[PDB]
Amino acid sequence: MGQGQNVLGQDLEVCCCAPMTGWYRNGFCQTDVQDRGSHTVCAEMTEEFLLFSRDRGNDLMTPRPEFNFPGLKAGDRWCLCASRWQEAFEAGMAPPVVLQSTEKSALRYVSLADLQAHALPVLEHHHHHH
C-alpha cells in the first residue's frame, strides 16, 4: 500500500536478476548473438494451468495419475516449451511469465505481446549502470 512505481514511469533494462552485475551469465539472458538465438525460452508454467491443459485433450505429463513426466514439469523456469506457454495463453489462461529471463529467440514460437500481457511482478532493482 501507499505509493508505487508504474511501467510507464522509468526503466525496463535487465541486470543479473540483482542490483549488482555478477557476470557468470545469469539474469542478463544475452544468449542471443544479436537477435536470433535458436531455441532459448526460460519461462515458468504452473501445475494449476498444466493439469487443466493435460486433461483438456493432450497429456503434458504421461496418461498416469502419478507424477511421471517425460521432461519440463510444473515450475521449471529453464528450457520451457514455448508452445506450452503459448497454448495456455490461447486457452484464455496464461501464468505470470518472466519478461526478464525469457530470451529474444522465444518471440518466434510466441510473441512479445503475449509475454507482456501476463508479465511477472515487476520488482524495481536499483540499476548501478548509472
Q: Report which residue type is found at 24.
A: Y
Cβ neighbours for 50, distance < 8 A, ≥ 6 positions apart: 60, 61, 73, 74, 84, 88
From which experimental method does this structure derive? NMR
97 three-class SS: strand
Alpha-carbon gap, residue 130 to 124, rounded angstroms: 15
Burial 93-127 (b: 16+ CB within 10 A, else e): ebbebbbbbbbbbbbeebeeebbeeeebeeeebee
Identify the CATH class of 47-121: mainly alpha
* 130 contacts 19 by C-beta, under 8 angstroms: no
Pairs from 115-120 (Cβ < 8 Å, separation ≥ 24): 117/89, 118/89, 118/94, 120/96
Phi, psi dihedrals of residue 100, rounded to the nearest 5°: -70, -45
Nearest-10 Cα torsion for 61, 66, 72, 73 = 100
Cell numbers describing residue 18: 540483482
Cell numbers describing residue 76: 521449471
